Design a protein around this ligand. Structure first.
Ligand SMILES: O=Cc1cccc([C@@H]2CC(=O)CS2(=O)=O)c1
Length: 282
């Protein structure tokens, strides 16, 4: 079976070698380095590929899996919020998908600022948050939606749709069914926003650094990677892109932890199987 235990063990073997090889060394030229004493990486060993980095002071990466273009990042640190909002505005972000739980955000020990559910001022940027609809995704998993209106004197005002899944626990995989529902919601949300820009003649539509969905959880490697893999499978341009390719690309473009847990890989495998998509490269 191309999805049996032998295939899965070979997949794991290739991916584990890759993870181990991509582990960050001290002052690794492959990874973005903190430029002074301000902390860059939320987690010391979850680093940001330098060549695909979005901003010099964020742990955030441009990701292209097959043809699917996204930004994956860590939950921004308090000191990073103004730069994070500039990244969101500059990218004309068509959807921000936050997969960190409400309980994580509320726990002040974790230093996860509540930046999208409340209005705020961050240096010269002001942000207005408004709640919109709520969508059940299956298995009691809920998506709460918001818009963030990002204002700054002398910048164009940009509003960003947010899909917050507030009850996807750390270090778990929601089911393949929930994942597919979530991927559809995120893609549909992005498409509606992109369409609006297109309807106004917007130039962002010609630029590939822009109009990227931005996805983060806590570290931006587990729940984030599971969603991005699912989104890549929802994109018809990615026929024959293997699970091996998809995971390897996320790893070389962000870090070797992408798809952190076996159960998160298993959801990708199950989604691939449902499509007749290969696990391994021949
Ligand atoms: O040390 C790495 C680390 C620390 C806290 C959380 C995680 C998460 C694993 C997940 O399932 C989603 S995540 O936030 O990338 C990874």
């Amino acid at each position: 079976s191309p999805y049996g235990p032998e295939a899965r063990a070979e997949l794991s073997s290739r991916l584990t070698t890759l993870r181990n090889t991509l582990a960050p060394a001290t002052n690794d030229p492959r990874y973005l380095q903190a430029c002074g004493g301000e902390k860059l990486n939320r987690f010391r060993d979850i680093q940001c590929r330098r060549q695909t980095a979005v901003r010099a002071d964020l742990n955030a990466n441009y990701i292209q899996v097959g043809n699917t273009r996204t930004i994956a990042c860590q939950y921004p640190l308090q000191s990073q919020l103004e730069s994070h909002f500039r990244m969101l505005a500059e990218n004309r972000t068509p959807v921000l998908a936050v997969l960190a739980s409400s309980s994580e955000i509320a726990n002040q020990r974790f230093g996860m600022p509540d930046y999208f559910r409340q209005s705020g001022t961050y240096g010269s940027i002001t942000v207005e948050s408004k709640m919109t609809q709520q969508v059940g995704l299956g298995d009691g998993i809920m998506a709460d939606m918001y818009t963030l209106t990002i204002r700054e004197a002398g910048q164009k005002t940009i509003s960003v749709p947010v899909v917050h899944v507030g009850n996807w626990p750390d270090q778990t995989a929601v089911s393949s069914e929930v994942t597919k529902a979530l991927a559809s919601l995120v893609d549909q949300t992005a498409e509606t926003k992109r369409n609006m820009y297109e309807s106004k003649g917007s130039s962002a539509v010609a630029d590939d650094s822009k109009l990227r969905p931005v996805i983060h959880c806590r570290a931006g490697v587990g729940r984030t990677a599971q969603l991005i893999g699912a989104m890549c499978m929802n994109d018809s341009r990615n026929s024959q892109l293997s699970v091996e390719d998809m995971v390897s690309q996320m790893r070389v473009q962000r870090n070797g932890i992408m798809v952190q847990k076996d159960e998160q890989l298993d959801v990708l495998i199950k989604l691939a199987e449902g499509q007749g998509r290969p696990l391994l490269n021949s």
